[PDB]
Amino acid sequence: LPNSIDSYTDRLYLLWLLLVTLAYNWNCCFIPLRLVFPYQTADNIHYWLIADIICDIIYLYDMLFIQPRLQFVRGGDIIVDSNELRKHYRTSTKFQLDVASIIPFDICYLFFGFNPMFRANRMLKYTSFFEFNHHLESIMDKAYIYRVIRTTGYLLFILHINACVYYWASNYEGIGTTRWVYDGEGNEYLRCYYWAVRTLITIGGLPEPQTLFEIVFQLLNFFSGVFVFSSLIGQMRDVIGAATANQNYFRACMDDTIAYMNNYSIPKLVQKRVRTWYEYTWDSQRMLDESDLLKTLPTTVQLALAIDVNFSIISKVDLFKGCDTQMIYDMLLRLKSVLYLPGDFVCKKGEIGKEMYIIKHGEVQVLGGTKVLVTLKAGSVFGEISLLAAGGGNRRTANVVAHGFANLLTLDKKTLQEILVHYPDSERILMKKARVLL
């Protein structure tokens, strides 16, 4: 028991919302069941009553000792102090529903006998059920399986409600009176659930209704069943379209570019190189483009994501010891991620150079013209001298190729110059660094 609660860190309060969920789901299931079936027999009222008592004690514990401890934000700063947090809870709309739900009509048992209709006010904890749904959906690493489980739970609960309503209508018409009503010969809940499935799934095969109450009942039940089955199809289709969305988009772009290459009659070697690029991109990133992903996020979180992945690789460069944090941060916000297939060139011996190559999960080899001079594991950097020098500069002195699936990080020359002209003193010391290099 802490002084306050952690809305996104408390495994304890997640199990507490699980316990309030079990209490509220107990009430939502079993208040129709006790209300319409003869299951509250004389040797069962004590068991049902201790169940409802521990349910209402869980309710009161939620209203008293947990809900005035949940943290919240007001004006951006998080709130820790207990009296102000309790005032925030008291002047919130959750306390309205909770005090409306804890209204104890159990004292009306001595005035009208035992009737679980009096406890129908305990169904108003739907807000604490939905907070549990949202917390479990946000914490679980697979939201689609919990969405399917929640859809099946809603379907089973609607069917239980319809079985209870059908059995109430069967008692109101008289058990075994007509041919539509429940005839009494089996397990009441099982045969009534069977009736609710074969009506509200809109399946058919049941006896034809005779009395006008039965025809109105069967008509409204079939119409709401068509709508429930349509909601089920739509819900499962949305779960599919939200679980396979990036896979379908990736496959769509891959198939559209293979359709483009087959429309232009592209040779088989170039098509195989393009498709093994797409297969390695899918097996690496599970995504097509990451720059387009980064351009949506805010600027400071873009900067933090760039620094946490590249600042050690920059600061381990012995040449970048003199430069400064602002334009290092900007040039790390302005890097490009590329992928070179095995056996391809990144710089030819005699090719002019205008880029700086940081390698990252790759293995390139320098050739001095097929014999490998050196190799470079992940974190190394090359291609510096033809980046910072103006004019023609120097060509690449050697062939360097990717041995494996190299994933380089490139910084172009003119983009570096555009970053540099916003930072004149560091540009000047970088020119002096060029002069002490050469």
Partner: protein, 445 residues
């Protein structure tokens, strides 16, 4: 001498008061035509309701002869031109055809009163646009349309049954001489039951016998499979539209999680970014404001920018003596960023090129050591207004003078130096006014 303005609320009150009798005319006119016991038994009620519906119809003709219409941007108001604009349309032809005043047992001659469906469609479209429950109204409209279709099919099935003969076959309605199958409630409820069990592909009806019944049942099942297809399509589109924004946000969360598991970020930064995005979702501002306001006109964007940011940009005492042109220019060119707790806004020794106007946040200035709260700022404060003027002569030289960290979930307003220079390159006197006020405040400090 009154002109009914078709964008006001009196026109919507008239759309409601005319979309009740059109809907009544459709529903209970096909019912009274096909049943022939309502029409014989409730004759006073049907004559009263028919006379009231025709009175509302002729008042709708008179009103639609006096609704203005936007030409040259203005609302025209001359009754002769409004009558001519009414008469040149075909809607007036449909209305004067529907108002034809036709032995009080066949309402088959009164089917011309159904021709004002345009009022019902206009009322449904105006309600869908106007009300604040759009998905609930779309489902209500779909339920109403398929209920009208099921009712029309129930009346059609009872008319086909009366044509074939009651109790002759096994598919048609039972014998109405037997007084259990003869109540009017029983007639209508069993006809509606048959049409729902047909038109929603349930299939629990007795099987047809003759060729005409086989053909009506196969046509009715094809209409039913199409109605079931549109029901499933509309409910699927409603479910896909009820949480489309939430699904987009969960896709963005999963994309960020995939990118971070790819690039191997640290767990503290991962949970910081995740709680940051969940706070941005719970505060209902996760979408960027330029992408929100892209579809707005420039004058409405300017009025929104005034109404948002001038309340804070008139609380500044340093930038007070300038003009409303620069005020509107800066509130157009302010761009917001939301931060995280413990984030460095501007560290000591950085090139100051941004200016920040705190709005619904709380920040702090610290030293190079770490958490020593020197001065906690609040809403309406400002910093950065001394390294973006670039004044020569002082000891700083556009260098950040303080370590500025956020302690809660702040929300600043980035005002960049290039943006201010673009704002002021057409105002040299405002440039030198800001230069002299910065020089005085810097010689003060």
């Amino acid at each position: 001498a009154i002109v009914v303005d078709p964008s006001s609320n009196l026109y919507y009150r008239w759309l409601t008061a005319i979309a009740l009798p059109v809907f009544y005319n459709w529903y209970l006119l096909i019912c009274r035509a096909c049943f022939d016991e309502l029409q014989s038994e409730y004759l006073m009620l049907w004559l009263v309701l028919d006379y009231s519906a025709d009175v509302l119809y002729v008042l709708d003709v008179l009103v639609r002869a006096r609704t203005g219409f936007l030409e040259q941007g203005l609302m025209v108001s001359d009754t002769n031109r409004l009558w001519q604009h009414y008469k040149t349309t075909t809607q007036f032809k449909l209305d004067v055809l529907s108002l034809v005043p036709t032995g009080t047992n066949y309402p088959e001659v009164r089917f011309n009163r159904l021709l004002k469906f345009s009022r019902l469609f206009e009322f449904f479209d105006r309600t869908e646009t106007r009300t604040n429950y759009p998905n609930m109204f779309r489902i209500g409209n779909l339920v109403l349309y398929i209920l009208i279709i099921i009712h029309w099919n129930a009346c059609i099935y009872f008319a086909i049954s009366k044509f074939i003969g009651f109790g002759t076959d096994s598919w048609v309605y039972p014998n109405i001489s037997i007084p259990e199958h003869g109540r009017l409630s029983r007639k209508y409820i069993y006809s509606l039951y048959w049409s729902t069990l047909t038109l929603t592909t349930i299939g629990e009806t007795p099987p047809p016998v003759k060729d005409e019944e086989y053909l009506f049942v196969v046509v009715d099942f094809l209409v039913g499979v199409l109605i079931f297809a549109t029901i499933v399509g509309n409910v699927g589109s409603m479910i896909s539209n009820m949480n489309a924004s939430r699904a987009e946000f969960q896709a963005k969360i999963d994309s960020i999680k995939q990118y971070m598991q790819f690039r191997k970020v640290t767990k503290d930064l991962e949970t910081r970014v995740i709680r940051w995005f969940d706070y941005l979702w719970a505060n209902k501002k996760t979408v960027d404001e330029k992408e929100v306001l892209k579809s707005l006109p420039d004058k409405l964007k300017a009025e929104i920018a005034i109404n948002v940011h001038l309340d804070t940009l008139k609380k500044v005492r340093i930038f007070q003596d300038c003009e409303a042109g620069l005020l509107v220019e800066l509130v157009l060119k302010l761009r917001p960023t939301v931060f995280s707790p413990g984030d460095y806004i501007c560290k000591k020794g950085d090139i100051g090129k941004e200016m920040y106007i705190i709005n619904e946040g709380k920040l702090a200035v610290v030293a190079d050591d770490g958490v020593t709260q020197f001065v906690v700022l609040s809403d309406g404060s400002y910093f950065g207004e001394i390294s973006i003027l670039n004044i020569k002569g002082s000891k700083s030289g556009n260098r950040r003078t303080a370590n500025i960290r956020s302690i809660g979930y702040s929300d600043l307003f980035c005002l960049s130096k290039d943006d201010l220079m673009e704002a002021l390159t057409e105002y040299p006197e405002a440039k030198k006014a800001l230069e002299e006020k910065g020089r005085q405040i810097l010689m003060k400090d």
